[PDB]
Swiss-Prot record:
It comes from Aspergillus fumigatus (strain ATCC MYA-4609 / CBS 101355 / FGSC A1100 / Af293) (Neosartorya fumigata). PANTHER family: EXO-ALPHA-SIALIDASE, SIALIDASE. It is an enzyme of class 3 (hydrolase). Optimum pH is 3.5. This is Exo-alpha-sialidase.
Length: 384
């Protein structure tokens, strides 16, 4: 791999700064956020980078008032290299006091940026009986229109500058009778053959036809997770790499738009039951797929980026621990992640971090780190 011979490069800094940090990220309206969680990042066809997160208003919890926030690079060419390269915090959607989340973007050929999102009402939570800031007790998410998880789509036609009011696609793209649902979170993909594939709970969402004017359909999957990732491997096949229901290992299945085989644990990819991210890097020799998760059966604080050279991504290398290039002052790094290629031949990664000031409790501030590193940096890691 010629990349190992390049000068290794890394830089990293907080991109979404929680309420407890100096210069916390707030909207121009003055609306602030206790925590930022659930990152998603894409590079547009112009080279601009768009970073999305859930703005969790009052606590770090997944229910209650949560808005979908974002930042863009100020120009199409700066590659988000330094803090001053990034615009201030903006909002995709924040209507009501319910939950707008699970950002799952994909960039189409015409530069339409699609962003699939999950939604639930202000008074509902996955488990039910959770206490809201005002003392209200939530109802459990159920199969009713009011109480179920919805699937929404918004898009941008101006390189992420503005977003449409999200359109509810639940009846079209979520099976009837479902209560809980999730899309991504992280990213969808565009195949060599032209289709879009967006990973979701128990299914893929497939986009066909004209870029930025797609016809959507559902590909049901057997044994898929709630939080899935998708990549097209060097062989042109599809690859689902999903969060397991119980701690242990990533669950992997391979297939095509005609169907997938069975999901099975990948023993080379330990996972503590957490979201992960995957990225198609290049198809020419040597072809590479990149993977990022917490490489541990128990902890989210073992973030590891890896490379596979396999046509079907059978095996990933040890890779490199992100702690080799640690960030100070932004809490304990580790959790959900998202990766993009940059325009200057780097990998850009968003990674959750937890101050843990309230332990596992709701008041522990959560921030999001932005990393840039090249293949050389990964390959020159001391553990492989
Ligand atoms: Cl198509
Ligand atoms: Na809101």
């Amino acid at each position: 791999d010629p990349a190992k011979s390049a000068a290794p490069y890394h830089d990293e800094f907080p991109l979404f700064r929680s309420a407890n940090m100096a210069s916390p990220d707030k909207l121009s309206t003055g609306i602030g956020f206790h925590s930022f969680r659930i990152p998603a990042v894409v590079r547009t066809t112009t080279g601009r980078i768009l970073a999305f997160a859930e703005g969790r208003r009052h606590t770090n919890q997944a229910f209650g008032d949560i808005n979908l926030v974002y930042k863009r690079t100020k120009t199409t060419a700066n590659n988000g290299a330094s803090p001053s390269d990034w615009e201030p915090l903006r909002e995709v959607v924040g209507s009501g006091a319910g939950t707008w989340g699970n950002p799952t973007p994909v960039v189409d050929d015409d530069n339409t940026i699609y962003l699939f999102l999950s939604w639930n009402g202000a008074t509902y939570s996955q488990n039910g009986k959770d206490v809201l800031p005002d003392g209200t007790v939530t109802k459990k998410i159920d199969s009713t229109w009011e109480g179920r998880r919805h699937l929404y789509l918004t898009e941008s036609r101006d390189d992420g500058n503005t977003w449409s009011k999200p359109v509810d696609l639940t009846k079209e793209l979520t099976p009837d009778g479902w209560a809980w649902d999730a899309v991504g979170p992280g990213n969808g993909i565009r195949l060599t053959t032209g289709e879009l594939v967006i990973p979701a709970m128990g299914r893929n969402i497939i986009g066909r036809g004209a870029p930025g004017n797609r016809t959507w359909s559902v590909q049901r999957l057997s044994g898929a997770g709630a939080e899935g990732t998708i990549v097209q491997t060097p062989d042109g096949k599809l690859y689902r790499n999903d969060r397991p229901s119980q701690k242990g290992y990533r669950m992997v299945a391979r297939g095509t738009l005609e169907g997938f085989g069975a999901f099975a644990p990948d023993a080379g990819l330990p996972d503590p039951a957490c979201q992960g991210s995957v990225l198609r890097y290049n198809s020419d020799a040597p072809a590479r797929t990149i993977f990022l998760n917490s490489a541990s059966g128990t902890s989210r604080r073992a973030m590891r980026v890896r490379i596979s050279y396999d046509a079907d991504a059978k095996k990933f290398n040890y890779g490199r621990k992100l702690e080799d290039a640690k960030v100070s002052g932004a809490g304990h790094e580790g959790g959900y992640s998202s990766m993009t290629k940059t325009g200057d031949y780097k990998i850009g990664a968003l990674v959750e971090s937890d101050f843990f000031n309230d332990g596992t409790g709701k008041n522990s501030y959560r921030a999001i780190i932005w990393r840039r590193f090249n293949l050389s940096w990964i390959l020159n890691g001391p553990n492989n």
